[PDB]
UniProtKB/Swiss-Prot annotation, chains A, B:
Changing D52H: Constitutively active. Residues 3-116 form the Response regulatory domain. Its main location: cytoplasm. Homodimer. The modification 4-aspartylphosphate is found at D52. Phosphorylated by WalK. The gene is walR. This is Transcriptional regulatory protein WalR. The keyword Lipoprotein does not apply.
Length: 120, 120
């Protein structure tokens, strides 16, 4: 089972992601802040991270940079629909993809699989 | 002005893409089949290609493989909403991203900009 780390401060969003991902058959662990995420990354070595761009402490942008100093597993940012820059910025700083909130399940699961499979 | 090659055989889709992209300030060129695309690529050297996965001649998958022999500019696949495999497959064979039809303008422009800016 592919291991996914869901990093989100809003429990209902983190929980609906964890629900859909476990259902599809992933092993899912949840972090609710920045530093806890970087810790969990070293212990679990997730296959993919879903990272809120708007974490309140250490930003998703800083989580991403700090993770990338050591690890290259796929990172997908979670962003609002209404901010172009939030979608764009993660791809400049080392994330692989983004999914917008609210997301369809359909799109979440495609994006996670496609990023798990991505070429070379 | 960034140069976009739109590769799609459905004139209405190709036209609405050209309309929105021009409006946003891109230079847009349109190919309606596989072989014409590959030619236009060497000829134009687009900064990004938007490629229908379902072209009737050479597939979007074969087009993307042919192009990737020589070029590594971003390629975004255009796919239906209802097929997970069509979204996943492009990313395995050398494409960078996918956008689903019908796409919002919002999402199309954000994807194109994010892929144009993408790190390393």
């Amino acid at each position: 089972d592919k291991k996914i780390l869901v990093v989100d401060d809003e429990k209902p969003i983190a929980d609906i992601l964890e629900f859909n991902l476990r259902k599809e058959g992933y092993e899912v662990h949840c972090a609710h802040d920045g530093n806890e995420a970087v810790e969990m990354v070293e212990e679990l070595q997730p296959d993919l991270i879903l990272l809120d761009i708007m974490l309140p402490n250490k930003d998703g942008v800083e989580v991403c940079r700090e993770v990338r100093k050591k690890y290259d597993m796929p990172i997908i940012m979670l962003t609002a629909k209404d901010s172009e820059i939030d979608k764009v910025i993660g791809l400049e700083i080392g994330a692989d993809d983004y999914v917008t909130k609210p997301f369809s399940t359909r799109e979440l699961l495609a994006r996670v699989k496609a990023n798990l499979r991505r070429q070379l």
